[model samples]
Target: TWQVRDLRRILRVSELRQHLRQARTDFRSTLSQFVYFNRSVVNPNAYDDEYLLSDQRLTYVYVDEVTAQLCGLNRLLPSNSPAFGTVATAMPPWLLDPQEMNAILQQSCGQGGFVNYHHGPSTNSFFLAILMSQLFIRIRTDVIRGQGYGWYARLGNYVEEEETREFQLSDLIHYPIVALGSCHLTR
Candidate 1:
């Protein structure tokens, strides 16, 4: 119903609405994939098999194991290994020094921990959702903004300075109503 000077080439409102719906579905699917990959890194024992449900009972134990590994402690190593026998040994400085490595453990162990599997998968899922939504918003908004700018680039030459100088949200909203009304009257 809406028409502009370079309007015929512009996408219709219904098409934009459809694009929005499709984008939401795509974004949600991508988010599920993101969680699938990250869940393993966060908790190695975490179940990824579609049929099997994830176990929450051992999540804290898995979290601690990874944290210790990051801090150069191989506590999860075989009992015969030197690392398992020792209290907590430091790895090489290049990979993870004793001082810097323990910092990761502290962050993971603190009251307001950087990571927490104890709360359940919902926390991580929500975190990923927030990050992905921001990315989606930027991408979709930029595309719409680019189209608006594209219209100017294509038809600026034909428009008068006064007509092209300013455009308001009110003008955009009412323009389509008036256009549809006039079309109906003419028909």
Candidate 2:
């Protein structure tokens, strides 16, 4: 039952990074590139290998540990649950006013379960978990024709020179807007 917590807690992100970096000396990438490469990636059930081993699972467990702290007990999730081993939705605690954010973490979907509140060390509850995390930071805006495609292409075309605007947030809050169209690089 609790093995999930202890196991993830034991892993250190720094130690995980070290494992992957050192093992890189043994490696090398892409997609058909994606298709062909996936054969090794494909059958790992195939379960990874010499070139891919290193910190693969180890890194995730490290992530799992932190995810447990930030998102809540990931291991407690069920195998049939959709959010298992992947990132779960979460919110800021302070958003709730008075009677808010309480309870032990409970499984909302999968192997891990966020509590009924986002308060304390946990995150994601109907009450306290309103401000779900979203990436509004460092979003780059370029001309996309449709609205600006030719303009966007030229921006990549550089010498021709294109205009690009960087968009981002100090971060957080519950403001939903449909971000569509295309893509650009940002940190």
Candidate 3:
């Protein structure tokens, strides 16, 4: 196995970033517009104090509609493994397993799972692996209606027009409720 306790330790951050960039660029060339919403907190200090901190972490929330289509297309193709290479490349094998694949595929009666990619360097505290495992959880809310006052009221109001939205630890736990409804974001 190529795995090692301190492998990639000698490589510089720029070098690792280059590899990741190349992998993504090459993969993007072969696919259509696949990513839906991708957000990154490159500099945690850029925002105001109320803004939750995110340092060196990336979150890529796939377009559920597009992924559902891709999954259907992928099902027609041959490999049903739900491997990262299906949509993009340079995915660390350690990040995915059969169970992860299954959880992603279960998104729309198994019509999802094109990509739910996140990445960060090993040294970063907001490492992709830790965020993937720890942050994805169910949201416990007091309201559950899709429409009307109670449903909309459950969401917090903006404190100031200039103030950026602040996210709580509890808020990060849940995936956007629109996509999965009641399902937990992570297993």
Candidate 4:
């Protein structure tokens, strides 16, 4: 049961990568066994009658393919109202100019990096959209060592060295969990 405030906007790339690495490591370690969890800060009660309608649902899209994604996401707006966050890792400065990035996040930091995601673009962007009301993000937390609970976002597939059983990004979107909100796009 948490909201945007629960997330700390990490600036330093090394720190962000380190944290992300640890989280993924923990996630992979407990990857086989699982539990699907969703809790809202608005309704932080663990016993809050299971799942109900979300008041302000945020649908964050992790995209590596910027332009086409922007087009598709623009189309999906009505379906994903109240907006969600976006992130583009390993993005080049040319795609997302340094000036625009700075103006968006309101911070002069890394270009086409982690910060650009939670930061912003238009009124439809994440930080700007959920800026006013607090949105509750819930996920299962396997307190192995407890640097954190669960990864805040529930993703479909995680890439490793080898690519064996694979499917399309949109394919995963059909799950009920995704219907509620969850999908990690590609570059």
Candidate 5:
């Protein structure tokens, strides 16, 4: 038989297990970095800019087509038109990604190498509409990795290689959505 006795104990907040583990982890190694750009910054060079578009969503072929069109190539002319981003040395609240090429193409008359999509003569909201339409047209990152100064490091193990699957750029652009008052919404 065992008898119960009065118990005495003391707890220290500074010595909590969670706090001790956090102190030992490499803060920088586990941190995430992000880069932001408004329409003005991204509009300087549609596809002709010397910088790589960080084309996470666009496919090799679609980019080539848009570039060709911009260069005044005589490609197939599609019935549906293209959307232009809003003015202000920047784009409207739209996410532009390379992956949107297919969706844009889908709305065309026919498809092949180069398809000409008309833009409205009215510049009022043309740019904004065009950019918005294409924004939500691609698949998003279903996986994750680590990087120093970007939302994501490498997409999948086969980013460089040709993708056996196709994803819309719009989907990729709207992949992450934020709700008001959500946890860490501002930061």
Candidate 6:
């Protein structure tokens, strides 16, 4: 019952288009380059929190909103529809092109964590879950290995380091061949 022209008109907002482009461009430029081995990392879902909440237009809307809207209209996506609340998988009318997916992935998965939890530990459980889950999934190079150890040993190792080492993207490029072998940290 919806017309393509109507949808096109709705998506033609210049401001929304600009913001979407900028967001996509940010993802690409940040992620395009390769990160080498043994580099220090922050966390995965790094900028997700700040990024998601930074712009009201870009912030994630809960299922409740969609559900309410649909119920009000007496129509809704199937409860099992996978598209609900999911991130953009491809260029939407407001998104960057598919050519930019790699870049977004890189920036999002690349820097690992420069923004999300940049403030150090959070008070929000939802935010924490997103952060932890993202870190575990993307920052494959920093996982802890050879189990039996706990937090105590990690503290000792941290305390023993007399000089702190900083590794940049250029330095870590092509390193950490196997994720498990690179188990130096965790999510």
Report, for every candidate in turn, its global Cα lDDT versus the true structure.
Answer: 0.21, 0.21, 0.24, 0.27, 0.20, 0.21
Give the true-structure RMSD of model 4: 15.9
Backbone clashes (count) for model 1: 0
Task: Sort the candidates on TM-score, descending order.
Answer: 4, 6, 3, 2, 5, 1
- Worst lDDT run of 10 residues, candidate 4, spans 176-185
Superior candidate under lDDT, 3 versus 5:
3
Relative to the unseen true structure, what is the C-alpha lDDT of residue 85 in candidate 6, on a scale of 0 to 100?
Answer: 13
lDDT of 2 at 79: 18
Q: Which 10 consecutive positions of candidate 1 have the poorest summed lDDT?
A: 177-186
Candidate 4 matches the true fold with a TM-score of 0.25
Superposition error at 130 for model 2 (Å): 24
**Candidate with maximal lDDT:** 4
Q: Tens digit of lDDT per residue, candidate 3, span 136-186?
A: 222222222342111011122211117364422221221211110101122
The digit string of per-residue lDDT tens for model 5 on 1-187 reads 1111101110232332232233223222222332222223344553211111222221111222233232212211111222311111111112222234233333321222222322211111111011112222232232223311111111211121164322221101211111000001111
**What's the CA error at residue 137 for candidate 1, in Å?**
14
Which segments of candidate 1 are over 4 A away from where they belong? Answer: 1-10, 35-187
Tell me the RMSD of model 3 versus the true structure.
18.0
| Candidate 6 overall lDDT versus native | 0.21
lDDT of 4 by residue, 1-187 (tens): 1111211243344544354344334433432443223333355554222222233222233222342233333322111111222221222122234445335323212233222333444321221111001112343332333333222222222211164322112211211112111111122
Q: How many residue pairs clash per model?
A: 0, 19, 0, 3, 26, 7
| Top candidate, metric TM-score | 4
1-187: candidate 1 lDDT, tens digit per residue? 1111111121354543343344334434444433332123244677332121122110011123233223212112111111111011111112223344345333322222233433432221110001111101111111232342111111111221154222211101111100000000100
Predicted candidate 6 versus true structure: per-residue lDDT over 1-187, tens digit per residue: 2110111122334644454445434433433453221323664433211111111122111122233233213321111111111121112222323234234433322122221212221200010001011111111121123322111100111121153433222211111100000001112
